[PDB]
Amino acid sequence: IVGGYTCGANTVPYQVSLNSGYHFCGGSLINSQWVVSAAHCYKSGIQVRLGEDNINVVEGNEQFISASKSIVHPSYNSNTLNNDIMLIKLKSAASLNSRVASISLPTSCASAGTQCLISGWGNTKSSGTSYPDVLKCLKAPILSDSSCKSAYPGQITSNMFCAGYLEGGKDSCQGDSGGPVVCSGKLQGIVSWGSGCAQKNKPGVYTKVCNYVSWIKQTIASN
């Protein structure tokens, strides 16, 4: 997250870190046995780390649980990042508590200008690299579909939305991928892609989770 703040330990209790020997993407806990992340985050051998704040120090509220299965959306297209969503099942259920909590799925898509919270352990530099050890947060509004599609002509699909600041400064960035965009208590977005971070007229692009609720519920219920 560029231009954001330190969240505060366990303040975003549905944020998980996906680890494969190191942090590589975020995700969101949607019930005790399932996480939703970006399909572009797929790899074999994922460990889900829940209850993290500093991802480099055991602080005493973590749960580390290996994935038993990954399910990439059936229409994920890695060339265009259309349908950039995946499901991850945990080998054993997470222990739900104040610091390890699920985030509700949306029932309709959210309006332009709705305020959202975006979080993750990604790069905090818009030019340069610096990775934070503690979870960072950003409040960002959903941008109109028209200003999203003007920002990235030819590349925004009905399954994507932009959130951020056209002026720049304040955006998600590398290593935030797969993590949550929560709006009015609902998981509305998954960190997906963009052009650099925090550049003028290049806001973050997010997987539009409201389009996927039936797939998410049917897939979980069948697996």
Ligand SMILES: NCc1cccc2c1OCCCO2
């Ligand atoms: N700024 C949105 C954004 C979000 C996640 C990863 C990114 C990214 O920007 C593209 C360059 C870094 O990869």
Ligand SMILES: [Ca+2]
């Ligand atoms: Ca930790």
